């Protein structure tokens, strides 16, 4: 499978793209971003189209596509 490219947007409206494959557990994405923002992953909620992204959600389960957006808010 190919990597798809998602855009993760933070509270400050800054921008980080992540590449994942369609069956990758998005907790790996959460961890990396939380680590890059210098905050505990559990202090954050990651939303796809307003819907909460579970640790074991995959882009396939959520119906994600290239250039889809993940929004990060405070928990």
């Amino acid at each position: 499978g190919e990597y798809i490219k998602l855009k993760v947007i933070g509270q400050d409206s800054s921008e980080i793209h992540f590449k994942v494959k369609m069956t990758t557990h998005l907790k790996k994405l959460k961890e990396s971003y939380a680590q890059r923002q210098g905050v505990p992953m559990n202090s954050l909620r990651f939303l796809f189209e307003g819907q909460r992204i579970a640790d074991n959600h995959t882009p396939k389960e959520l119906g994600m596509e290239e250039e889809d957006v993940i929004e990060v808010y405070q928990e």
């Binding site: 990597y3 800054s14 921008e15 793209h17 990758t24």
Partner: peptide, 15 residues
């Protein structure tokens, strides 16, 4: 701000 692309397993890759 520069473009940032992180690969969750080279950021140009698609496989």
């Amino acid at each position: 701000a520069e473009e940032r692309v992180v690969v969750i397993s080279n950021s140009s890759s698609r496989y």
